[PDB]
Motif scaffolding. Sequence first.
Motif, mmCIF file in Angstrom:
data_model
loop_
_atom_site.group_PDB
_atom_site.id
_atom_site.type_symbol
_atom_site.label_atom_id
_atom_site.label_comp_id
_atom_site.label_asym_id
_atom_site.label_seq_id
_atom_site.Cartn_x
_atom_site.Cartn_y
_atom_site.Cartn_z
ATOM 1 N N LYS A 74 -3.287 -20.394 -57.969
ATOM 2 C CA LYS A 74 -2.149 -19.583 -58.381
ATOM 3 C C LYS A 74 -0.814 -20.273 -58.131
ATOM 4 O O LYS A 74 0.108 -20.154 -58.939
ATOM 5 C CB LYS A 74 -2.231 -18.241 -57.654
ATOM 6 C CG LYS A 74 -1.139 -17.263 -57.958
ATOM 7 C CD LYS A 74 -1.376 -15.980 -57.192
ATOM 8 C CE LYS A 74 -1.484 -16.220 -55.726
ATOM 9 N NZ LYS A 74 -1.536 -14.926 -55.017
ATOM 10 N N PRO B 173 1.266 -15.416 -61.418
ATOM 11 C CA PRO B 173 0.228 -14.579 -60.812
ATOM 12 C C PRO B 173 -1.008 -14.428 -61.684
ATOM 13 O O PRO B 173 -0.966 -14.582 -62.904
ATOM 14 C CB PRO B 173 0.924 -13.226 -60.640
ATOM 15 C CG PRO B 173 2.003 -13.228 -61.635
ATOM 16 C CD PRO B 173 2.440 -14.634 -61.833
ATOM 17 N N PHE C 291 -1.344 -5.437 -64.716
ATOM 18 C CA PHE C 291 -1.307 -3.988 -64.794
ATOM 19 C C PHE C 291 -1.993 -3.557 -66.076
ATOM 20 O O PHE C 291 -1.824 -4.178 -67.127
ATOM 21 C CB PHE C 291 0.124 -3.464 -64.752
ATOM 22 C CG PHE C 291 0.740 -3.513 -63.394
ATOM 23 C CD1 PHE C 291 1.336 -4.667 -62.938
ATOM 24 C CD2 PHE C 291 0.733 -2.403 -62.578
ATOM 25 C CE1 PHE C 291 1.904 -4.719 -61.695
ATOM 26 C CE2 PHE C 291 1.302 -2.446 -61.329
ATOM 27 C CZ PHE C 291 1.889 -3.605 -60.889
ATOM 28 N N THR D 162 -1.199 3.863 -65.663
ATOM 29 C CA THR D 162 -0.924 2.460 -65.387
ATOM 30 C C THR D 162 -1.354 2.165 -63.958
ATOM 31 O O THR D 162 -0.865 2.799 -63.018
ATOM 32 C CB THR D 162 0.554 2.136 -65.579
ATOM 33 O OG1 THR D 162 0.840 2.009 -66.976
ATOM 34 C CG2 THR D 162 0.893 0.834 -64.887
ATOM 35 N N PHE E 134 -2.971 -1.112 -61.130
ATOM 36 C CA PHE E 134 -2.803 -2.524 -60.823
ATOM 37 C C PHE E 134 -4.155 -3.140 -60.496
ATOM 38 O O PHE E 134 -4.929 -2.576 -59.716
ATOM 39 C CB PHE E 134 -1.831 -2.691 -59.655
ATOM 40 C CG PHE E 134 -1.665 -4.099 -59.190
ATOM 41 C CD1 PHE E 134 -1.203 -5.069 -60.049
ATOM 42 C CD2 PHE E 134 -1.924 -4.442 -57.886
ATOM 43 C CE1 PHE E 134 -1.030 -6.359 -59.622
ATOM 44 C CE2 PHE E 134 -1.752 -5.729 -57.454
ATOM 45 C CZ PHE E 134 -1.305 -6.688 -58.323
ATOM 46 N N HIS F 195 -5.518 -5.298 -58.688
ATOM 47 C CA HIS F 195 -5.947 -5.397 -57.293
ATOM 48 C C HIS F 195 -5.313 -4.224 -56.552
ATOM 49 O O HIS F 195 -4.261 -4.363 -55.930
ATOM 50 C CB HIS F 195 -5.541 -6.735 -56.689
ATOM 51 C CG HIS F 195 -5.974 -7.922 -57.492
ATOM 52 N ND1 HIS F 195 -5.437 -8.226 -58.723
ATOM 53 C CD2 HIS F 195 -6.906 -8.870 -57.246
ATOM 54 C CE1 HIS F 195 -6.011 -9.316 -59.195
ATOM 55 N NE2 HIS F 195 -6.909 -9.725 -58.318
ATOM 56 N N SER F 196 -5.975 -3.069 -56.602
ATOM 57 C CA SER F 196 -5.294 -1.813 -56.308
ATOM 58 C C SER F 196 -4.812 -1.754 -54.867
ATOM 59 O O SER F 196 -3.605 -1.747 -54.613
ATOM 60 C CB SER F 196 -6.206 -0.630 -56.612
ATOM 61 O OG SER F 196 -5.457 0.570 -56.608
ATOM 62 N N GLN F 197 -5.740 -1.756 -53.912
ATOM 63 C CA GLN F 197 -5.569 -1.486 -52.487
ATOM 64 C C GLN F 197 -5.601 0.007 -52.165
ATOM 65 O O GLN F 197 -5.579 0.361 -50.987
ATOM 66 C CB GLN F 197 -4.267 -2.074 -51.907
ATOM 67 C CG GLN F 197 -4.361 -3.482 -51.388
ATOM 68 C CD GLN F 197 -2.992 -4.082 -51.142
ATOM 69 O OE1 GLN F 197 -2.192 -3.541 -50.387
ATOM 70 N NE2 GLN F 197 -2.713 -5.199 -51.795
ATOM 71 N N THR F 198 -5.687 0.895 -53.151
ATOM 72 C CA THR F 198 -5.702 2.328 -52.891
ATOM 73 C C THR F 198 -6.729 3.007 -53.781
ATOM 74 O O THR F 198 -6.995 2.550 -54.895
ATOM 75 C CB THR F 198 -4.331 2.970 -53.138
ATOM 76 O OG1 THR F 198 -3.697 2.324 -54.245
ATOM 77 C CG2 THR F 198 -3.444 2.858 -51.911
ATOM 78 N N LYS G 24 -2.039 -5.106 -70.246
ATOM 79 C CA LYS G 24 -0.776 -4.773 -70.882
ATOM 80 C C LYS G 24 0.430 -5.082 -70.009
ATOM 81 O O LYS G 24 1.451 -5.565 -70.494
ATOM 82 C CB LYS G 24 -0.811 -3.301 -71.282
ATOM 83 C CG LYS G 24 -1.030 -2.350 -70.127
ATOM 84 C CD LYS G 24 0.251 -1.820 -69.549
ATOM 85 C CE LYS G 24 0.042 -1.365 -68.131
ATOM 86 N NZ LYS G 24 1.319 -0.889 -67.576
ATOM 87 N N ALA H 137 2.410 -14.436 -55.583
ATOM 88 C CA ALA H 137 3.169 -15.333 -56.450
ATOM 89 C C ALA H 137 3.896 -14.498 -57.495
ATOM 90 O O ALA H 137 3.279 -14.022 -58.449
ATOM 91 C CB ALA H 137 2.257 -16.358 -57.105
ATOM 92 N N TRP I 178 7.112 -2.910 -70.977
ATOM 93 C CA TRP I 178 6.495 -1.589 -70.937
ATOM 94 C C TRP I 178 7.001 -0.704 -69.811
ATOM 95 O O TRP I 178 6.563 0.445 -69.716
ATOM 96 C CB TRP I 178 4.976 -1.719 -70.815
ATOM 97 C CG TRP I 178 4.528 -2.468 -69.590
ATOM 98 C CD1 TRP I 178 4.279 -3.802 -69.498
ATOM 99 C CD2 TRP I 178 4.307 -1.929 -68.284
ATOM 100 N NE1 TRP I 178 3.901 -4.125 -68.226
ATOM 101 C CE2 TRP I 178 3.915 -2.992 -67.458
ATOM 102 C CE3 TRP I 178 4.400 -0.649 -67.737
ATOM 103 C CZ2 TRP I 178 3.612 -2.818 -66.115
ATOM 104 C CZ3 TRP I 178 4.102 -0.476 -66.406
ATOM 105 C CH2 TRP I 178 3.709 -1.554 -65.608
ATOM 106 N N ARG J 287 3.892 -0.073 -56.438
ATOM 107 C CA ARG J 287 2.994 -0.939 -57.191
ATOM 108 C C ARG J 287 1.789 -0.175 -57.701
ATOM 109 O O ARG J 287 1.345 -0.387 -58.833
ATOM 110 C CB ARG J 287 2.531 -2.101 -56.327
ATOM 111 C CG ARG J 287 2.084 -3.311 -57.108
ATOM 112 C CD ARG J 287 1.453 -4.261 -56.146
ATOM 113 N NE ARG J 287 0.430 -3.565 -55.383
ATOM 114 C CZ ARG J 287 -0.154 -4.061 -54.305
ATOM 115 N NH1 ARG J 287 0.205 -5.250 -53.854
ATOM 116 N NH2 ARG J 287 -1.075 -3.361 -53.668
ATOM 117 N N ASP J 288 1.246 0.719 -56.885
ATOM 118 C CA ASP J 288 -0.084 1.228 -57.178
ATOM 119 C C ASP J 288 -0.078 2.481 -58.037
ATOM 120 O O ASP J 288 -0.822 2.560 -59.018
ATOM 121 C CB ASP J 288 -0.809 1.517 -55.873
ATOM 122 C CG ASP J 288 -1.758 0.431 -55.506
ATOM 123 O OD1 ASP J 288 -2.636 0.113 -56.330
ATOM 124 O OD2 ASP J 288 -1.615 -0.110 -54.396
ATOM 125 N N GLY K 60 3.343 2.313 -61.253
ATOM 126 C CA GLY K 60 3.481 1.181 -62.151
ATOM 127 C C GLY K 60 4.804 0.458 -62.057
ATOM 128 O O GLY K 60 5.349 0.028 -63.081
#
Lengths: 202, 128, 70, 169, 150, 76
Positions: free
Chosen positions: C8, C16, C20, C33, C35, C37-40, C70, E14, E24, E54-55, E58
């Motif tokens: 990376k 990266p 998303f 929407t 992500f 690599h969520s973590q949640t 997207k 990164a 978007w 982030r989660d 969005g």
Amino acid sequence: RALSQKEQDIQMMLAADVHLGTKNCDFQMERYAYKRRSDGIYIINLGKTWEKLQLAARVIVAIENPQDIIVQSARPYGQRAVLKFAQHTGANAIAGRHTPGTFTNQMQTSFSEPRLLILTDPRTDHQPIKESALGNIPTIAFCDTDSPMRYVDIGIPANNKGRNSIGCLYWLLARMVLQMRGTILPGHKWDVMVDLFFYRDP
Amino acid sequence: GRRILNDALRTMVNAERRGKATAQLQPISGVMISFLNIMKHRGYIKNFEVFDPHRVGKITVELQGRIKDCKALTYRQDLRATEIEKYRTRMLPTRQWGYVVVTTPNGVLDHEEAIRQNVGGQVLGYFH
Amino acid sequence: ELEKLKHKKKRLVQSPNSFFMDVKCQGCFNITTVFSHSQTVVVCPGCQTVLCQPTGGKARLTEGCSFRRK
Amino acid sequence: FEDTVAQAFFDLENGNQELKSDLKDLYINTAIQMDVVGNRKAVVIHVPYRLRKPFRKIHVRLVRELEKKFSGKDVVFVATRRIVRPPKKGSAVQRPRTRTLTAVHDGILEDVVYPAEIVGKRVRYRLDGAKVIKIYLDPKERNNTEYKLETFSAVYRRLCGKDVVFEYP
Amino acid sequence: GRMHSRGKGISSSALPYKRTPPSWVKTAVADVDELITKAAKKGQMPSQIGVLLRDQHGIPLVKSVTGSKILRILKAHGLAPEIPEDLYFLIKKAVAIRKHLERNRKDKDSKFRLILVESRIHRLARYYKRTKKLPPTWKYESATASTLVA
Amino acid sequence: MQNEVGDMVDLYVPRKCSATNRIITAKDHASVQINIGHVDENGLYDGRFTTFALSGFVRAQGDADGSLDRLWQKRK
RNA sequence: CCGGCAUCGCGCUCCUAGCC
Ligand SMILES: [Mg+2]
Ligand SMILES: [Mg+2]
């Protein structure tokens, strides 16, 4: 239309299994492998094999006295090839064991001062390769995808470990040498058959 | 653990000694670019490019095959216009070629332009 | 080009590997929407379905939940 | 030329129902015609600062208009920034990192090419000392701005004095 | 490498080239401001808040969307914590280790680790006093350290 | 190189490797000089060739093959 | 090699101060 000479060589080398490499790849031989199959063996870019064959041919033809070229094969499958290659192009074949000191020992009876040196396989013909680096002798070799490329100038990438490939490559070098020398005129008619180059098992 | 202009010049010596045609310097600075300009204007490297992805930076240099050794004098000594002579005897292969790079309030420049413009400064490195 | 295989941060211009994505469950065809690599553990506000799972890498979507980069 | 473009700008509010709520609101500082290669010409406009998000909000259905309400040659739009000379050897005046040559010219870079979004840069140092700033634009939004690329370079040579060429991935 | 080990990992995030928010992302700076303050008043530190945005909502990065770092957002609204986040967490871990240590006095590995964590606390506190994010009189008691946090 | 009175005082300006620009010394016996011939038309060979020199350094790295490949791709 | 300017060069009453 018909097929161009490049297309016909591609056909023949593909028939003789020249395109079919080995499981491993030397990094310096990586500039010539196209891709690797699930078998694990690499496939050789025959277009780059043909381009190197042209380059080798243009280097061979420029030798004003062909008796200043030594061709050589330690393997048993390359005897009959390097003999006929030597007999139609006029170079000096030495097949089998190479006598250490042939290129560096002037008082030997087997002593030669070649302006060029052609090798079936850099792996088994490593003694003439080492002896070359002491006599300013350029070298052309037929290099599989596992061939060490130390001290080799022009390397033709190919399967050098098969009975039909060695013969067809040497036949096809000889053909270009004769064409550029003009002994074969434009027009693909050359009468010596590729079956002369495969070796005969008694 | 970093003090650049040593990693850049030593990467270039290693790359040139292996005969590579392209070298890549990860952390850049104005000092490095100014040094490389002296290198080019005296003829020892080909053209080079800054690649800004965003960060400290990145550059790629085109090696011409004529540089023999380029290094830094870290612990940059103070160097007046009268002791230029003795540094170049200690550090350059002859009185005929090779340059010592000095940073001066009139910019970064080689020792010969420094003699002409009559300014001293601090030594950065050399190349020959 | 072979940069897509590189690390990376070791590319010529760093970038990266995550994204998303617009995700869609079955019982409520709204688009959320989320992500990569969520973590949640995330649930869509309407249908209340558990939607993805935190892992050590990219999040694991649940059964039959379409998504689009997207 | 300031006043003929002032007049051209002053009355588009008649007709074109959809352009209302945009140009009842904004004077330009200056506009100058400048010559691009080939005896083609172009024009540059300078919105002061406060309304740059307004122009960049639309910047398409009116930039076409000044090639149809002017219909001779190209126009470009930038926002005037003040560049301050670097503070003297210490004078206890910090010069915020904006209004610095680097930041200002990066703004004029980002706005001269506004329809597209900048995705990379390279600075080439030619042998004899020429310097080139090659810029990679987003590959989308490409049939909008590919013919003003010579224009864009001509614009950049004027107000920043740099040699930039543009290209796409 | 690591300050207090021989590990040399380079795993980290990164950020992209592109500074501006994505095409978007349609949310407006005031709504994001509102989400940040809402999560903050609930007790979430800037790292947890960033993970949330982030989660769920969005938001890739607030500094790209809103133009201001999340800590600066919390400061402008008077909601940043008194003890900075990383020092807060180091203090909490040191307290946990010490609490474990009074129950196991022959566990010398945890004594070594306690020394390492207090070393890290002192170094970060030196930084914080130097840069005026802590009072120039703040000092770390082993005794009265659980009163400050948790 | 040159005396200050115009004269040339070196003897035997050496060859330089065509890949790395290193000097090919008098005692470097791993270097070679290749003359590749020019094919033009009917006959496809006259005494026209281009020459490339490779020092023992390149030849011993193995990079002689790649260097020669890349140096032959120059068009005239 | 350098002076003297001009680009988008935070000011002067007071010393030196060109024919505004
Ligand atoms: Mg490291
Ligand atoms: Mg340490």
